[PDB]
Every structure is written in structure tokens, then in C-alpha cells.
Amino acid sequence: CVPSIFRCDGVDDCHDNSDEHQCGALNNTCSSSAFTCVHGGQCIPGQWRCDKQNDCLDGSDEQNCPTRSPSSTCPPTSFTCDNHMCIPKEWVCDTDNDCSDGSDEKNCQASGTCHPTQFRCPDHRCISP
């Protein structure tokens, strides 16, 4: 016994390969700048189409995905953190620990003080004279 939703989702749950034996119904088009999976007929973002993790039930996203040079460093437009995580460089200094180790904020100057050309108020705010 398998939930009715699975009867048409492209990969047979019933090991007799009797789920999509007669359903078909591949009548719709996924939107562009996105990706439709070859079996089951679902829509997932373009990024999911070829990434280390498979997304659609058919696994057709990674069924046709190259080696993609796994030894390469992350793009230098981003920043790296102690826990081997890579995040955009803009995030390096803000109020958010964008990586669990917090190594982005660890180096920052730790001071939101106002310029001498302004006035300072107790709760993280500065106002023009």
C-alpha cells in the first residue's frame, strides 16, 4: 500500500514497477530559467539542476552533472570561515554571524560609534546635528 500521491510521481514506489504504469499526464511546462525533471514532471530551481545533492525523485538532476572540479577553492568573491564554510565577502562584517564559527565577525572593529559630525543616542543610533 502506497499513498495515492506517489502513483504518478515518475519513480515507482511499488517495487513491481506498477506506479506509473498508466498515469502519464506530462501535460504542463515548468517556467523558464528553471528546470523540469525528466521523470515525474516537477519544477526545481536551476541551482538544484547540478549540485552535490540530488533533488527530484528521479535523480535526473545529478544523472547528467560533471565532476565540476571538486578540488577547487570557493570563488574569491566570497569569504571562508574556520568551519570550512564559504559566504559572500560583504557579510564579513555585520551584526550577523553568517557562519556558525563566527570567524567573519571575529576580526571586525566591534564599534558602531558615531562620527564627530553627528550626535550619539544610547540604542545604536546616530543623528545629524
Binding site: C1, P3, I44, D55, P88, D98, C99
Partner: protein, 129 residues
């Protein structure tokens, strides 16, 4: 509508709805772990937790008529639904919670998956830890 949130003061409530990793006791809206069933302890309030059917081997005839797991509970054939899943009113069928249904489950795009979810942000945005 009544701005004091007192128009809906007597509105109905949903069932006790024990988590999928647990079991419910009839007549008292109380929850006991699945391990508690068919163990000889009288966990439920008035002895509702045990019956000698705890050995009726209902499971092997046809997986109890259930999709994921069968436990020979106090009421004979009882079924267990994994984490992230839910059990229909049909005591056998087990289905996947569409987490995306709750507004704001994730910031921008949500895609339902069997017992799981995946989320995606627009190109000018990225996703966090």
C-alpha cells in the same frame, strides 16, 4: 476581526495530534512513546495501553497494510509514520507534511519533498546556514 482577538474566543480546536514518533491514548488526550506499546508497562491511564494482541504477529501478512512501519500495538495492527510525515485518518496511510503550506516557513521559495523541504532565494539573494 474583533480587535481584542475575542471574537474567536470559543473557536474549535484541532486533535491532540501526537507527534509521528509517538502514540496517543484513547479518551484522555495523552501521549506515550511507541516504545511504551507492547512492553507490559501500563503507561496509559486506565490500562488502555496493553492487550495480549501484543503478540498476534499482525505485521507479516502484508506489512499490516501500511506503507512504512507496523507495530503490533494494543489494538492489533498499528502503523508508524517517520519524522516529517503524518498519518491520515485512514489509520494505515502515511503522507508527507507540506511544510511550505505554513506561511513563512522559509524566506522566499519552498519545495516540498518526501518528509523534507528545500528552500531557494532569488538571484540577488543567497541562503544562510
Amino acid at each position: 476581526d474583533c480587535r481584542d482577538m475575542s471574537d474567536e474566543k470559543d473557536c474549535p480546536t484541532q486533535p491532540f495530534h501526537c507527534p509521528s514518533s509517538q502514540w496517543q491514548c484513547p479518551g484522555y488526550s495523552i501521549c506515550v512513546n511507541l516504545s511504551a506499546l507492547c512492553d507490559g508497562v501500563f503507561d496509559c491511564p486506565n490500562g488502555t495501553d496493553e492487550s495480549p494482541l501484543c503478540n498476534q504477529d499482525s505485521c507479516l501478512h502484508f506489512n499490516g497494510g501500511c506503507t512504512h512501519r507496523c507495530i503490533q500495538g494494543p489494538f492489533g495492527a498499528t502503523c508508524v509514520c517517520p519524522i516529517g510525515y503524518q498519518l491520515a485518518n485512514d489509520t494505515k496511510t502515511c503522507e508527507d507534511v507540506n511544510e511550505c503550506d505554513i506561511p513563512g516557513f522559509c524566506s522566499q521559495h519552498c519545495v516540498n519533498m518526501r518528509g523534507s523541504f528545500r528552500c531557494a532565494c532569488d538571484p540577488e539573494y543567497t541562503l544562510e546556514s
